[PDB]
Amino acid sequence: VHFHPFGNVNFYEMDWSLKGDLWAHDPVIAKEGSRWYVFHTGSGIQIKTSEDGVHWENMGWVFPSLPDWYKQYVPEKDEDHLWAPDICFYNGIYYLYYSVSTFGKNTSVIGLATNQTLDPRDPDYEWKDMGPVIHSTASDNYNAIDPNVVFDQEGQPWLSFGSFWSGIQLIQLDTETMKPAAQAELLTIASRGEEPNAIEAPFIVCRNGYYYLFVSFDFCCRGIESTYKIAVGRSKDITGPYVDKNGVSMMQGGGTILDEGNDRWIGPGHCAVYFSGVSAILVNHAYDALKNGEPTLQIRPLYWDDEGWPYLSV
Ligand SMILES: [Ca+2]
């Protein structure tokens, strides 16, 4: 996947028994050369690195001091946590989208940081503040958080995003600015059809001519009382309709459940899906019932059945 490259390594062969610094919430992963990186929710966007994808070490943050412009969109934000980063690699540049918001409110903005490299040893390492991408106010019927970029088969970048309110949104990006045109249409592509509308954290991938929309249902952020689950649907066209195994549109609460956790891992969600060759991984967090509900990084091989639907195993 040109914009999420993982070399030749074979995820289905690897031992994904993670070790090290595994606290994480809302992760994404990128690999540049021999080094792997996690970005996740936390102060200034938290970063972890690994040599192998398995042993993780905490490594700094993107924004030591938050951009002044956040206050123009979310003036009541009073702490430095940035949420749900998303990484892609295009034209030599790393594009890191992220969320500026306050929990449970839809006064929100997605920002963009860019870097020439992910390696802080490189003289050109610098996370540049490239400003807002899309925002919501309290009279909008959507929430501008939880970005994900996908490039369709034809090379057009799209941004999906959303949490609660009318649900998951989709908008085209321009290839040079990596932002929507000012008159670009905003499409709604998934919704529980319930109030509150507990759907968020979209992630789209293409496999064999279908677009797969992964989302998280129900409630994060409650430790062992979290009810998060990972759901998926698919469409031949990136604008929908995304439908689940049963033929139900994701605009009507459709979605096939991929993981709802167990008595040890509570509330898995906020996922990402990456490929290397025909192998794939699912990345998410889950709340550790054996460690005070602390949110923990999970990376697992993601298999695909003979109808094209993803599944986990043991
Ligand atoms: Ca995400």
Curated annotation (Swiss-Prot):
Site (Important for catalytic activity, responsible for pKa modulation of the active site Glu and correct orientation of both the proton donor and substrate) location in chain: D146
Active site: D26 (proton acceptor), E200 (proton donor)
Cofactor(s) needed: Ca(2+)
Positions bound to substrate: D26, G104, N143, A144, I145, D146, S163, F164, W165
UniProt subcellular location: Cytoplasm
Source organism phylogeny: Bacteria, Bacillati, Bacillota, Bacilli, Bacillales
Cofactor binding mode and count: Binds 1 Ca(2+) ion per subunit.
GO terms under biological process: arabinan catabolic process
GO molecular function: arabinan endo-1,5-alpha-L-arabinosidase activity; metal ion binding
The protein's name: Intracellular endo-alpha-(1->5)-L-arabinanase
Reaction equation(s) it catalyzes: Endohydrolysis of (1->5)-alpha-arabinofuranosidic linkages in (1->5)-arabinans
Annotated metabolic or biological route of this protein: Glycan metabolism; L-arabinan degradation
Induction of its expression: Transcription is repressed by glucose and by the binding of AraR to the operon promoter. L-arabinose acts as an inducer by inhibiting the binding of AraR to the DNA, thus allowing expression of the gene.
EC number of the protein: 3.2.1.99
GO cellular component, as recorded: cytoplasm
